[PDB]
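PROTEIN DESIGN WORKSHEET
SECTION A - STRUCTURE
LENGTH: 442
TOKENS:
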């Protein structure tokens, strides 16, 4: 340990297929897994949904089309596809038009019944909810439910800073930001804040020091259904389709209408690969609630996802996670809690079934891709191209979970759970020593 005063390490290193570990340091102690949770999410997803699962979104008609008039409702059934884009909506609407519908004598329903309850997992800090990495992974996603904004200081200090936003983003921005004389010391404790409101309103408050250039800001959409509905409304109007009713949310499970247009995501194995390479929280969390929906045939919720993942691990993978707490798929939640010894059983299962799962090729390869392209510790250990592992990074948490091929060619699984990390290169020195050790001595 080259580690800062008071950091907490739980570490286990074990040959693939071996029954005893080579390194065992507090391996039974529960810890915050952060994004290494995604290893569990990917395995349960492959087992439950399979590599060829695709998310799907449809436009459905309920009623007869007479003389180009739908006598009934248009239903836009969202399916938690994390990769759905504005263009996909525009294309599905183009297809609707081409099918013969010019007018809807009825309502436009934004159907999110695939999921229920909150779009935010237990244990997610409230303060990060407006940041894109923590965007609520709702059933209705368009362009990752993230949008950007430019904040301009006013030429006269004391005047309102002003917001520029692209006109297509259906959000409502208000500025209550005071522009400060670019020296004086309201600047020290006057915060610049974002305050979300209902229906995708955002108010910027506080102070902004004079700047020559505008401040770029990216925010998370809080109400995906409303956002997706406004985009749909816009695309309908552009395509010349009129309607007499209003846009309504449909949350209760219901029989599908006639599918007039659809979009399916890339295959799940492809999505899980992005997820593990890049640590994509939104893919992990839409997958997570999908798992529960598919296993129990109920609208997907965080609790059903948690129950399902535990059941899948125990029953299909032979891993009893015991008192482990699984709160989400991404590892964002501070309620996730698992011991290296438990994550080790998952890793051993994966290595044993890797020819079936094609799992290890999806993990970041040190020195090549994803989160490990340049991890100084690993590069300096001389283990580039020898480590395939998932990172887990949160405020003062630096985890790694995966596989290393050692100097003798032995594959070893490892779990490094390092937290309570706080500062007044210790990591880099720690990692370069440890992985050089593991590689060289095994
Ligand atoms: C998994 O650990 C995820 N981490 C987060 O969502 C939040 O990450 C941080 C928050 C505060 C301070 C430091 C990190 C995913 N892994 C991250 C990573 O850096 O790879 C991420 C930001 C891409 S999200």
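SECTION B - SEQUENCE
RESIDUE ASSIGNMENT:
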């Amino acid at each position: 340990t080259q580690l800062p005063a008071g950091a907490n390490l739980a570490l286990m290193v074990q040959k693939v297929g071996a029954s005893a570990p080579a390194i065992d340091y507090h391996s039974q102690q529960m810890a915050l897994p952060a994004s290494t949770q995604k290893v569990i999410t990917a395995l349960a997803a492959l087992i439950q949904l399979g590599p060829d699962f695709r998310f799907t979104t449809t436009l459905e008609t309920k009623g007869n089309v007479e003389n180009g008039v739908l006598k009934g409702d248009l239903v836009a059934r969202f399916g938690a596809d994390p990769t759905l884009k504005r263009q996909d909506i525009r294309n599905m609407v183009a297809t609707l038009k081409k099918s013969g519908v010019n007018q809807i004598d009825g309502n436009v329903l934004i159907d999110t019944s695939i999921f229920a309850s909150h779009d935010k997992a237990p244990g997610w800090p409230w303060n990060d909810m407006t940041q894109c990495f923590s965007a609520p992974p709702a059933a209705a996603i368009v362009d990752r439910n993230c949008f950007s904004v430019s904040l301009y200081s006013a030429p006269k200090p004391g005047d309102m800073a002003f917001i520029r936003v692209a006109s297509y983003y259906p959000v409502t921005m208000f500025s209550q930001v005071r522009t400060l004389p670019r020296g004086s010391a309201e600047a020290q404790y006057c915060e610049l804040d974002v305050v979300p409101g209902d229906l995708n309103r955002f108010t910027l408050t506080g102070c902004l020091p004079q700047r020559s250039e505008p401040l770029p800001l990216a925010f998370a959409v809080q109400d995906g259904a409303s956002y997706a509905g406004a985009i749909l409304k816009y695309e309908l109007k552009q395509a010349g389709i009129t309607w007499s009713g209003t846009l309504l949310r449909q949350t209760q499970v219901n029989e599908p209408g006639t599918v007039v247009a659809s979009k399916q995501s890339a295959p799940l194995h492809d999505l899980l690969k992005i997820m593990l390479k890049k640590s994509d929280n939104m893919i992990a969390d839409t997958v997570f609630r999908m798992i529960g929906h598919a296993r129990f045939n109920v609208p997907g919720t965080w609790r059903a996802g948690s129950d399902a993942v535990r059941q899948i691990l125990r029953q299909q993978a032979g891993v009893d996670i015991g008192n482990t707490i699984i709160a989400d798929g991404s590892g964002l939640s501070r309620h996730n809690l698992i011991a290296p010894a438990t994550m080790m059983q998952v890793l051993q299962y994966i290595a044993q079934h890797d020819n079936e799962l094609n799992f290890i090729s999806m993990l970041p390869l040190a020195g090549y891709d994803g989160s490990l392209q340049y991890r100084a510790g690993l590069h300096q250990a001389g283990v580039d191209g020898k480590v395939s592992a998932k990172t887990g990074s949160l405020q003062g948490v630096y985890n790694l979970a995966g596989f290393i091929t050692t100097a003798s060619g032995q594959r070893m699984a490892f779990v490094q759970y390092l937290s309570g990390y706080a500062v007044e290169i210790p990591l880099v020195r720690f990692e370069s020593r440890l992985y050089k050790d593991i590689y060289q001595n095994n």
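SECTION C - NOTES
The CA atoms of residues 178 and 207 lie 5 Å apart.
The chain is about 25% helix and 25% strand.
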